[PDB]
Amino acid sequence: MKVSIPDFEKEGEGKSKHVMYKIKVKTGGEEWAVYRRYSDFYWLHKKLQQRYPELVPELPPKKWIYSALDEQILEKRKQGLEKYIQRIVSHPVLANDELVVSFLQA
Distance CA 55, CA 44 (A): 13
- CA nearest neighbour of 27 among 1, 62, 49: 1
Residue ranges covered by each domain of the chain: 1-106
CATH of 1-106, one of 3.30.1520.10, 3.40.50.1580, 3.40.50.720, 3.40.50.300: 3.30.1520.10
Distance CA 40, CA 49 (A): 14
Phi, psi (deg, nearest 5) at residue 18: -120, 155
- Tell me which method was used to determine the 3D structure: X-ray
Find the DSSP H helices in the chain: 38-51, 71-89, 92-95, 98-105
Question: Using CA of residue 78, residue 97, residue 35, residue 40, what is the dihedral sign?
Answer: negative
Burial class (CB in 10 A: 0-12, 13-18, 19+), 95: middle
Classify strands 30-37 and 2-11 as parallel, antiparallel or unpaired.
unpaired
